[PDB]
Design an enzyme around this catalytic site. Structure first.
Site, PDB file in Angstrom:
ATOM      1  CG  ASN A 199      -1.528  -1.340   1.498  1.00  0.00           C
ATOM      2  OD1 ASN A 199      -1.799  -2.083   0.545  1.00  0.00           O
ATOM      3  ND2 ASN A 199      -1.635  -1.735   2.769  1.00  0.00           N
ATOM      4  CG  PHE A 200       3.392   4.429   0.432  1.00  0.00           C
ATOM      5  CD1 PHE A 200       4.593   4.039   1.023  1.00  0.00           C
ATOM      6  CD2 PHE A 200       3.239   5.720  -0.046  1.00  0.00           C
ATOM      7  CE1 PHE A 200       5.633   4.940   1.120  1.00  0.00           C
ATOM      8  CE2 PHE A 200       4.258   6.621   0.043  1.00  0.00           C
ATOM      9  CZ  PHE A 200       5.459   6.244   0.623  1.00  0.00           C
ATOM     10  CG  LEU A 251      -6.334  -1.442   4.119  1.00  0.00           C
ATOM     11  CD1 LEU A 251      -7.448  -1.288   3.056  1.00  0.00           C
ATOM     12  CD2 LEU A 251      -6.086  -2.918   4.402  1.00  0.00           C
ATOM     13  CG  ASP A 290      -6.583  -7.354  -8.878  1.00  0.00           C
ATOM     14  OD1 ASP A 290      -5.505  -7.552  -9.481  1.00  0.00           O
ATOM     15  OD2 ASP A 290      -6.630  -6.804  -7.757  1.00  0.00           O
TER      16      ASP A 290
HETATM   17  C1  LIG Z   1      -2.205  -9.830   8.230  1.00  0.00           C
HETATM   18  C2  LIG Z   1      -2.569  -8.316   8.551  1.00  0.00           C
HETATM   19  C3  LIG Z   1      -1.571  -7.507   7.642  1.00  0.00           C
HETATM   20  C4  LIG Z   1      -2.227  -7.993  10.015  1.00  0.00           C
HETATM   21  C5  LIG Z   1      -4.090  -8.010   8.320  1.00  0.00           C
HETATM   22  C6  LIG Z   1      -4.430  -6.696   7.705  1.00  0.00           C
HETATM   23  C7  LIG Z   1      -5.797  -6.404   7.465  1.00  0.00           C
HETATM   24  C8  LIG Z   1      -6.746  -7.445   7.854  1.00  0.00           C
HETATM   25  N1  LIG Z   1      -8.048  -7.202   7.636  1.00  0.00           N
HETATM   26  C9  LIG Z   1      -8.684  -6.561   6.501  1.00  0.00           C
HETATM   27  N2  LIG Z   1     -10.003  -6.399   6.472  1.00  0.00           N
HETATM   28  C10 LIG Z   1     -10.279  -5.802   5.255  1.00  0.00           C
HETATM   29  C11 LIG Z   1     -11.560  -5.383   4.635  1.00  0.00           C
HETATM   30  C12 LIG Z   1     -11.523  -4.773   3.306  1.00  0.00           C
HETATM   31  C13 LIG Z   1     -10.190  -4.615   2.664  1.00  0.00           C
HETATM   32  C14 LIG Z   1     -10.160  -3.995   1.408  1.00  0.00           C
HETATM   33  N3  LIG Z   1     -10.103  -3.534   0.360  1.00  0.00           N
HETATM   34  C15 LIG Z   1      -8.879  -5.020   3.236  1.00  0.00           C
HETATM   35  C16 LIG Z   1      -8.940  -5.631   4.570  1.00  0.00           C
HETATM   36  N4  LIG Z   1      -7.995  -6.134   5.427  1.00  0.00           N
HETATM   37  C17 LIG Z   1      -6.481  -8.750   8.465  1.00  0.00           C
HETATM   38  C18 LIG Z   1      -5.094  -9.052   8.713  1.00  0.00           C
END
Ligand SMILES: CC(C)(C)c1ccc(Nc2nc3ccc(C#N)cc3[nH]2)cc1
EC number: 2.7.11.1
Length: 302
Positions: A21-22, A25, A130
């Site tokens: 990302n950067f 997110l 994707d």
């Molecule tokens: C493994 C780690 C990097 C800690 C991690 C990072 C995020 C999430 N959870 C997560 N929930 C989400 C919902 C929507 C989107 C989009 N577009 C990306 C997500 N990431 C679960 C684990």
């Protein structure tokens, strides 16, 4: 003022989560309900905007099984933000956690769900475009959908059925390559317009990737992206399905079927699923959602 970034009336923006990302997110919290959420951010100064229409794609997808719930879209400082349900780790994260190889049972449980997931998306007149392990995430421990495989990032999606004409988009070539090379279909490599068949072929490549631990075109490098793309494409064409899928007859049958679909053709989702449910039953497996990662320590932003 405050020093704190808010999204809408109740979403507090927090630390950035995930890899790469950067700062696009971030973990967030719904102050009104006391729940954590995920917040996708895009600088209002972006060259190639994708956020607001990805949001529109979610509106079109509506509420679905395995589709993350979307709560808000709005300005945030010099960012445009989209707030969604927080999920668990991606399939790539779990793959690493399982030493980069999934058992056939785990793969089939994943494939059965993803074929249905893709059929849902296609039934909303959209093609994904994707496919990659990083875009499929399990639910959150507890929030009762932890075993459910979700699909995220519709930033590259496209309506394959023209909303007005109600006709399938026309065939054409010379499309620039941007997607992830490791999983893309052969026809995509050829610069052809992508359709339903391509999403499915990409899933196949990913299934074999999980089963073998890697793909035979995975280490190709070149001096230009276009050159790398061409090399990977050549190797995919030069690798017989019966070799790529050695020891997994059903995977070969699946891949051969999707690779031969016509551009305009609607895939036979039931047929593809049955290839896998028949095998599943034949092996004596039980669809109990006990994947290979069950019991381990899962990475979490909270
Ligand atoms: C493994 C780690 C990097 C800690 C991690 C990072 C995020 C999430 N959870 C997560 N929930 C989400 C919902 C929507 C989107 C989009 N577009 C990306 C997500 N990431 C679960 C684990």
């Amino acid at each position: 003022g405050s020093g704190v970034l808010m999204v809408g009336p109740n979403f507090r923006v927090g630390k950035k989560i995930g890899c790469g990302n950067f700062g696009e997110l971030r973990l967030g919290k719904n102050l009104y309900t006391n729940e954590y959420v995920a917040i996708k951010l895009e600088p209002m100064k972006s060259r190639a905007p994708q956020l607001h229409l990805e949001y529109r794609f979610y509106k079109q997808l509506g509420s679905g099984d395995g589709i993350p719930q979307v709560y808000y879209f709005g300005p945030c400082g010099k960012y445009n933000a989209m707030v969604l349900e927080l999920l668990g780790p991606s399939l790539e994260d779990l793959f690493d956690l399982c030493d980069r190889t999934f058992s056939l049972k785990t793969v089939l449980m994943i494939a059965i769900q993803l074929i249905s997931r893709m059929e849902y998306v296609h039934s909303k007149n959209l093609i994904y475009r994707d496919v990659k392990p990083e875009n499929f995430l399990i639910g959150r421990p507890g929030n009762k959908t932890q075993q459910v495989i979700h699909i995220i990032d519709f930033g590259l999606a496209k309506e394959y059925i023209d909303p007005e004409t109600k006709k399938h988009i026309p065939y054409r070539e010379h499309k620039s390559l941007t997607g992830t090379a490791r999983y893309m279909s052969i026809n995509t490599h050829l610069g052809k317009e992508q359709s339903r068949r391509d999403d499915l072929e990409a899933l196949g490549h990913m299934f074999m990737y999980f089963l073998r631990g890697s793909l035979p075109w995975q280490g190709l490098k070149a001096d230009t992206l276009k050159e790398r793309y061409q090399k990977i494409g050549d190797t995919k064409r030069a690798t017989p399905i019966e070799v790529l899928c050695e020891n997994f007859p059903e995977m070969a049958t699946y891949l051969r079927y999707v690779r031969r679909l016509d551009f305009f053709e609607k895939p036979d989702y039931d047929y593809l699923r049955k290839l896998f449910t028949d095998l599943f039953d034949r092996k004596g497996y039980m669809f109990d959602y006990e994947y290979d990662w069950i019991g381990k320590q899962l990475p979490t932003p909270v």
